[model samples]
Target: LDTAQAPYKGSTVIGHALSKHAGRHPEIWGKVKGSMSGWNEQAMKHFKEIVRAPGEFRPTMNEKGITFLEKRLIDGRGVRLNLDGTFKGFID
Candidate 1:
């Protein structure tokens, strides 16, 4: 999924089905049903560390895209998705 649709939700019913599902689709092409890097297990530990330090959407980002002017923004102004799989900030 893209950044707007990053976390795809689904718990595996079985490993065989999941493995087949992975092989049948491409992350850059098909609809990303889940993380291409595998959203399970230790995935986030690896995924979120991509940049040296990541930026956040402050509560103020609700009205505009801040990415052009800032890589990091204050928490009081925009939307943010918390680590525990919950929505917070401006949107909710």
Candidate 2:
């Protein structure tokens, strides 16, 4: 099958770098999933949507990147998106 044969077939952002990479914290999915099982599905899903608004995050190096004020994400709660595919954290 070609790469495009079933694009997004499984319908997951897991490896898309726009969604949380389950591999990055392999130690937590089970625990998190387990915990999330008891969480309010709507709230959890809403939180995910809020963060994803800036797109998924993938770490980067010296290539091109965007610098967002940490204050934005901190203040607005994941409101800013950096060009490097990473989310900016807010300062205290």
TM-scores of the candidates are 0.23, 0.24
- Per-residue CA lDDT of model 2 for 30-83, tens digit only, reads 222333223333223534555556544433333556445332232233323345
Compare the candidates by TM-score and give the number of the best one: 2
Which candidate leads the pack in lDDT?
Answer: 2
Candidate 1's error at 42, in angstroms?
Answer: 6.2
Question: What TM-score does structure 1 among the candidates reach?
Answer: 0.23
What's model 2's overall lDDT? 0.32
Over 4 Å off in model 1, which ranges?
Answer: 1-9, 12-38, 50-57, 60-79, 82-92
Against the correct fold, how does model 2 do in TM-score? 0.24
Residue by residue across 1-92, what tens digits does model 1's lDDT show? 13323344452212222334334533411223444444332223222332234564333333565322122322212234444333321111
Candidate 1 residue pairs in backbone clash: 58-77, 58-78, 59-77, 59-78, 60-77, 60-78
Q: Each model's RMSD to truth, in Å?
A: 11.3, 10.0
Whole-model lDDT per candidate: 0.31, 0.32
Output candidate 2 Cα RMSD.
10.0
